[PDB]
Predict the structure of Flagellin.
Amino acid sequence: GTVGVTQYTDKSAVASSVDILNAVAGADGNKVTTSADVGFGTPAAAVTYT
Amino acid sequence: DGQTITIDLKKIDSDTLGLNGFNVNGKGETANTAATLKDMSGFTAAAAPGGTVGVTQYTDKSAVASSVDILNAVAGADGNKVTTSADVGFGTPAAAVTYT
Amino acid sequence: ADTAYMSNGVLSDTPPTYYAQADGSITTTEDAAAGKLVYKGSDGKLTTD
């Protein structure tokens, strides 16, 4: 509510897919839910693998 | 390592030595400086009536005029209206107020 | 969803937020009492050291 201050944001920091994969692999014990995987899950009969 | 001698160097030029143009003769028109936001230490106002958060209104108070200033201002224009009581001579008893 | 943002070295749901003070200074939070006024130099990215 202080009008004496003004907010600036640095956009264009959009996460890339490789960055998200690196982030999830960085920590141990995370959760990934994906469908339409190569080999296993190619028919994509089920979605929730985790 | 660490056993050195230090030589002090100062920026020596027209500006640092002062006087920024000696200008003995005068009659020379000179440009002004910029806004210099740092100097504007007057009364701060977070009003911003336009709603723009990127602007902050600064007002410079202590510009209140004196009584003689008000009298000079009203006398400068021709045809003004001044309502007063407790005048010297006429109106000293001040039976009436609105003379104008 | 545009809800994943590159921080300095980690992945965060929020983009880097910067606040510009009345006196021209830059700080991360509204109150100047906190914030650890932002710095820059020799590497860019406005790192806070």
